Write a protein that binds this ligand. Structure first.
Ligand SMILES: [Mg+2]
Ligand SMILES: [Mg+2]
Ligand SMILES: [Mg+2]
Ligand SMILES: [Mg+2]
Ligand SMILES: [Mg+2]
Ligand SMILES: [Mg+2]
Ligand SMILES: [Mg+2]
Ligand SMILES: [Mg+2]
Ligand SMILES: [Mg+2]
Ligand SMILES: [Mg+2]
Ligand SMILES: [Mg+2]
Ligand SMILES: [Mg+2]
Ligand SMILES: [Mg+2]
Ligand SMILES: [Mg+2]
Ligand SMILES: [Mg+2]
Ligand SMILES: [Mg+2]
Ligand SMILES: [Mg+2]
Ligand SMILES: [Mg+2]
Ligand SMILES: [Mg+2]
Ligand SMILES: [Mg+2]
Ligand SMILES: [Mg+2]
Ligand SMILES: [Mg+2]
Ligand SMILES: [Mg+2]
Ligand SMILES: [Mg+2]
Ligand SMILES: [Mg+2]
Ligand SMILES: [Mg+2]
Ligand SMILES: [Mg+2]
Ligand SMILES: [Mg+2]
Ligand SMILES: [Mg+2]
Ligand SMILES: [Mg+2]
Ligand SMILES: [Mg+2]
Ligand SMILES: [Mg+2]
Ligand SMILES: [Mg+2]
Ligand SMILES: [Mg+2]
Ligand SMILES: [Mg+2]
Ligand SMILES: [Mg+2]
Ligand SMILES: [Zn+2]
Lengths: 127, 24, 98, 60, 206, 80, 118, 155
RNA sequence: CGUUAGUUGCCAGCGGUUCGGCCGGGCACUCUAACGGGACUGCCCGCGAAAGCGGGAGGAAGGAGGGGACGACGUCUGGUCAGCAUGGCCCUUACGGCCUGGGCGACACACGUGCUACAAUGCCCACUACAAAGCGAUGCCACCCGGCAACGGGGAGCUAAUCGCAAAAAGGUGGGCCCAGUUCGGAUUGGGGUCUGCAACCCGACCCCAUGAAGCCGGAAUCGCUAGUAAUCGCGGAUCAGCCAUGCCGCGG
């Protein structure tokens, strides 16, 4: 009937709701492309469906909030892959070598006192 | 650039409002 | 409508405080909504470590105000009965609005 | 600083603008956090003493 | 110039604030002020009684100040004589109509501020500092106290050159915030100048 | 680019002084430490010693200079 | 296409062409294109002598312009210089007026660097 | 890298050609973290090169890169006073980085107005054997075989 | 990842719709904030005497997962008696004390640290989209009205997961500029004006008109960063009536 995955990337959440359907994707009440498309990496979000050739099998309804649209895209990749695993757990061994089901834990490094931006040190002369 | 106070971006650089950057 | 605003610097004083309230109101009232936690207001202060510079050595402290909501639904007496003055905690602070 | 310069305590400033912070514990003129009424130094000393409730060691 | 304050380090775990209450933007300033005046006047009048910690709690306009003293007898007085004089003197300063509590301290040699104070007292009367120091570390060590350390600052023995003294015993691991190290500071004022007296005591593990 | 927006400010010390000096005729040098103040047209013709911090400088106030403030004619610094 | 005191912007957009006039910036150019009902985007070369004559009408006598402007600003300086005004002293010694710092970075107002020994 | 080998970063395959070399090239075009801009530059340039010439832009990208790859370069080595320019071979990894970098830095020295125009045209020239990139490669290969007399300093 | 908890969340689900989570209502999800679980070279192959090293599966994550807080005996006669404390020496119609004014803002020069740029991977204009973290009771100020605007009047809400700062900016679509000291660049200067403040000459910020400088990627030399890093983009706060903040301390794209 319906399958779900959460997914998360860099301070952003995107709930992925998969249902068997035509293959048309909805995000935040806008067409997938009306949200994206001006952004080249957009299609990467859907890479989980191309690995298992689940293109025309599922429609999806997404809820994306937090961060910027790139991290949103990755969150969508993860959500699609999580639902896609709950649908058929036999997809795990197919989706794992690609690492679409792995969370990207890299986040903005904290600004540290004494430095300009958490790594970049203020320049000096010695004379 | 961000230095021209009568451009939109110079306004947002100073965090100010005027003719070249209204509010709504 | 009975709102109970719970605020404190210690997060264990707020919990040890709210739990007694719910245990006093569950013996009488309806199913209390719950100890719904509200987000934490964090005031930070950054200070240069020494006097008379060595600017680049500052250490910062943070004071964190924690907030909790209670919301007893339809209490009459045996709720307010155990609620007159029975609480132990000190650093907690409570407001009531109707 | 000087005792006389704590005339701010007795302000009656004759103009509202001549009121300044003046850390109470040490009489510091310059850098005085307004929420504690102390200066940065006295704030550090009283925070390390533990006499400032809720004030922890910031870490993240 | 290293080694930040141990009590300031441990405020989170294995140390509790000397002031525990709640306040807002409009309140905290003068409540903290009041706490400071309290600790001030108490440190004045009770130094001979050997006070270590003053705890200030507030629920609503009530003040639950608890003084921790080596000899509660000096505090109370004969049949409650001094605890009248100065406890009324307290509510004269702050109109809080504030109450007061007294608590004994077992083994005054085990409370770091008290140890520091005792050593500084010995210094103001000009005793041999290494003896006072090692002796104090014995008084601490001879009762519980899995660790102990005592530091005395410059101008030792009135010497022209400032010096720094020593002789911890046991184990005093400031770097680990596990095992409830106690700290106390004392100040010996003398003709040759000022002398800092630091007292570390190490008790308990988890 | 200069702005007081309304009620053009002039200190009351010399105001009540110069206006009364008008009724009795043009007077001689006057003493002023208040350069905070603007100039008004009824000062024209007088002679006002303004303070720079060190000395009193005599200033002949003319028609063309009514808009400025005292001390625009009594500079502070001394260079070369 | 001469509009103001002799001024011949050419081959460009009229609104930007007018900038080449002394008393006209982007604001006064967009205004004169506005109230004269001329498409600002037209090439100067494509301008009707009717539109041109209207532009000369508006611009020539609405605001004081190139010559009278240069003169009026000069006389405005000599105004505060002839009087003992402080601003006048700053204009005399070739120093910043607006209350800038002179200890460094006075380069625009004064005599690009003329170095001495030490 | 004093301790370890400092393993090479593994780039993500190209969203369009599924090819990693393309992604790296986009990375060298990208400035101030604008990868969307850089990608639109590169792909619009793929339209240019695929139209003005009727061949697949993929094969031309690879060929253009391949003709800029230097097989030998020169490196200074401090020997008995003033150092020497010493020829030696070029790591395949280093051939990669140098060829892409040279391609981009050359394309931006072109007279063409828009970015993707320069990218396309430099790609075509370099694939035909001409163009500034192939001249940096030919000049570096001239640095070797000229100081060839120091082929015993290989290190 | 789970437990507790549901006035941030939700046609996942149905009910109503002024199609706005608005209502009904529900806690599943997102989240908020407290307690927990989890990773241990525990498993496989290989090497090894061992510690350990290499590789692999499972796993969100592995060999210190990433970032903090944390800086030993001591060194430098390091830094500060001008934050505080303080020995000694001096001053006491005065080195003290009050005020007004000026100075700490001086300019023939030199270095440090930064900002904005010299442009087309750009500039401008319209439209439109996605953050985290903080601050606010005479303060934050939606919204109406006047004003090109700074702003003024009026005036709602918010003791603030419920109100407001608020618009994020780069970006996306559309359009203009066409390689030019310019639709680059915003210094300098005239002129007009808002605001805070008793008061803006010395000496403030801000707005509008006009002026539109140097500068077309920088000599010898020299600095930063090894991954959400550099680079770049905006946002917030501390002090403070205001502000010379391009600083600093944080935040995320
Ligand atoms: Mg279902
Ligand atoms: Mg950043
Ligand atoms: Mg962070
Ligand atoms: Mg501009
Ligand atoms: Mg500093
Ligand atoms: Mg003093
Ligand atoms: Mg002030
Ligand atoms: Mg504890
Ligand atoms: Mg001695
Ligand atoms: Mg401990
Ligand atoms: Mg344990
Ligand atoms: Mg969870
Ligand atoms: Mg809620
Ligand atoms: Mg939903
Ligand atoms: Mg073996
Ligand atoms: Mg391994
Ligand atoms: Mg492995
Ligand atoms: Mg691993
Ligand atoms: Mg660690
Ligand atoms: Mg760790
Ligand atoms: Mg450690
Ligand atoms: Mg010295
Ligand atoms: Mg020293
Ligand atoms: Mg200075
Ligand atoms: Mg209007
Ligand atoms: Mg809400
Ligand atoms: Mg709420
Ligand atoms: Mg609430
Ligand atoms: Mg365009
Ligand atoms: Mg221009
Ligand atoms: Mg030039
Ligand atoms: Mg140019
Ligand atoms: Mg490193
Ligand atoms: Mg401010
Ligand atoms: Mg200034
Ligand atoms: Mg700022
Ligand atoms: Zn202080």
């Amino acid at each position: 009937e319906q399958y779900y995955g959460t997914g998360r990337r860099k301070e952003a959440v995107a709930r992925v709701f998969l249902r068997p359907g035509n293959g048309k994707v909805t995000v935040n009440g806008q067409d997938f492309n009306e949200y994206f498309q001006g952004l080249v990496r957009a299609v990467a979000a859907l890479e989980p469906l191309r690995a298992v050739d689940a293109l025309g099998h599922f429609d999806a309804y997404i809820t994306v909030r937090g961060g910027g649209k790139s991290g949103q895209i990755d969150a969508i990749k993860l959500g699609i892959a999580r639902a896609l695993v709950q649908y058929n757990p036999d997809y795990r061994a197919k989706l794992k070598p690609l690492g679409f089901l792995t969370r990207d834990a890299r986040v903005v490094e904290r600004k540290k006192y004494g430095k300009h931006k958490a790594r970049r040190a203020p320049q000096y002369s010695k004379r | 650039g961000k230095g021209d106070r009568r451009t939109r971006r110079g306004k947002i650089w100073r965090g100010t409002y005027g003719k070249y950057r209204p509010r709504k | 409508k009975i709102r109970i605003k719970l605020r404190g610097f210690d997060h264990k004083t707020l919990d040890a405080s709210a739990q007694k309230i719910v245990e006093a109101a569950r013996r009488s009232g309806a199913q209390v909504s719950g100890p719904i936690p509200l987000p934490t207001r964090v005031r930070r202060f950054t200070v240069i470590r020494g006097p008379f510079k060595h600017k680049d050595s500052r250490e910062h402290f943070e004071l964190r105000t924690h907030n909790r909501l209670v919301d007893i639904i339809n209490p009459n007496r045996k709720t307010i009965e155990q609620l007159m003055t029975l609480d132990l905690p000190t650093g907690v602070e409570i407001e009531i609005k109707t | 600083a000087r005792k006389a310069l704590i005339e701010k305590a007795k302000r009656t400033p004759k103009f509202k603008v001549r009121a300044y912070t003046r850390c109470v514990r040490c009489g510091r003129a310059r850098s005085v956090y307004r929420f504690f009424g102390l200066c940065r130094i006295c704030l550090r000393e009283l925070a390390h003493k533990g006499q400032l409730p809720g004030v922890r060691k910031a870490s993240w | 110039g290293n080694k930040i304050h141990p009590i300031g380090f441990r405020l989170g775990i294995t140390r509790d604030w000397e002031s525990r209450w709640y306040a807002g933007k409009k309140q905290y300033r003068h409540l903290l002020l009041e706490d400071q005046r309290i600790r001030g006047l108490l440190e004045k009048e009770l130094y001979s009684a050997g006070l270590a910690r003053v705890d200030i709690e507030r629920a609503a306009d009530n003040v639950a100040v608890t003084v921790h003293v080596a000899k509660p007898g000096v505090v109370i007085g004969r049949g409650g004589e001094r605890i009248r004089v100065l406890r009324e003197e307290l509510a004269k300063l702050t109109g809080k109509n504030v109450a007061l509590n007294v608590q004994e301290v077992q083994n005054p040699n085990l409370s770091a501020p008290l140890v520091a104070q005792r050593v500084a007292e010995q210094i103001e009367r000009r005793f041999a500092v290494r003896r006072a120091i090692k002796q104090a570390v014995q008084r601490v060590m001879e009762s519980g106290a899995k660790g102990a350390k005592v530091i005395v600052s410059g101008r030792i023995g009135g010497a022209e050159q400032a010096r720094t003294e020593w002789a911890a015993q046991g184990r005093v691991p400031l770097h680990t915030l596990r095992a409830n190290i106690d700290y106390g500071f004392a100040l010996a004022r003398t003709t040759y100048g000022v002398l800092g007296v630091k007292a570390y005591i190490f008790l308990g593990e988890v | 680019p200069r702005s007081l927006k309304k009620g053009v400010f002039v200190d009351d010390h010399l105001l009540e002084k110069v206006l009364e000096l008008n009724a009795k005729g043009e007077k001689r040098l006057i003493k002023t430490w208040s350069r905070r103040s603007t100039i008004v047209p009824e000062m024209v013709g007088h002679t006002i010693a303004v303070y720079n911090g060190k000395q009193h400088v005599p200033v002949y106030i003319t028609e063309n200079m009514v808009g400025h403030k005292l001390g625009e004619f009594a500079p502070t610094r001394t260079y070369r | 296409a001469r509009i103001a005191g002799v001024e011949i912007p050419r081959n460009k957009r009229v609104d930007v062409a007018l900038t080449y006039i002394y008393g006209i910036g982007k604001a006064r150019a967009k205004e004169a294109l506005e109230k004269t009902g001329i498409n600002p985007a037209t090439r100067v070369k494509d301008l009707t002598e009717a539109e041109v004559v209207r532009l000369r009408e508006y611009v020539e006598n609405t605001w004081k312009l190139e010559g009278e402007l240069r003169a009026e600003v000069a006389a405005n300086i000599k105004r505060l210089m002839d009087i003992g005004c402080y601003r006048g002293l700053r204009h005399r010694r070739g120093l910043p007026v607006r209350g800038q710092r002179t200890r460094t970075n006075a380069r625009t107002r004064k005599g690009p660097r003329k170095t001495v020994a030490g | 890298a004093r301790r370890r080998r400092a393993e090479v970063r593994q780039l993500q395959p190209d969203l369009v050609y599924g090819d990693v070399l393309v992604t790296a090239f986009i990375n060298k075009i990208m400035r101030d973290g604008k990868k969307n801009l850089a990608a639109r530059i590169f792909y619009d340039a793929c339209k240019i090169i695929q139209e003005k010439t009727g061949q697949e832009p993929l094969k031309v990208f690879k060929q253009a890169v391949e003709n800029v790859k230097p097989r030998m370069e020169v490196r200074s080595r401090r020997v008995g006073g003033a150092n020497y320019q010493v020829p030696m071979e070029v790591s395949p990894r280093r051939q990669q980085s140098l060829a892409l970098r040279w391609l981009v830095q050359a394309a931006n020295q072109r007279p063409e107005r828009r970015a993707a125009v320069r990218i396309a045209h430099e790609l075509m020239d370099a694939a035909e054997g001409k163009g500034g990139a192939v001249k940096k490669k030919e000049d570096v290969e001239r640095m070797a075989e000229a100081n060839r007399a120091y082929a015993h300093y290989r290190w």
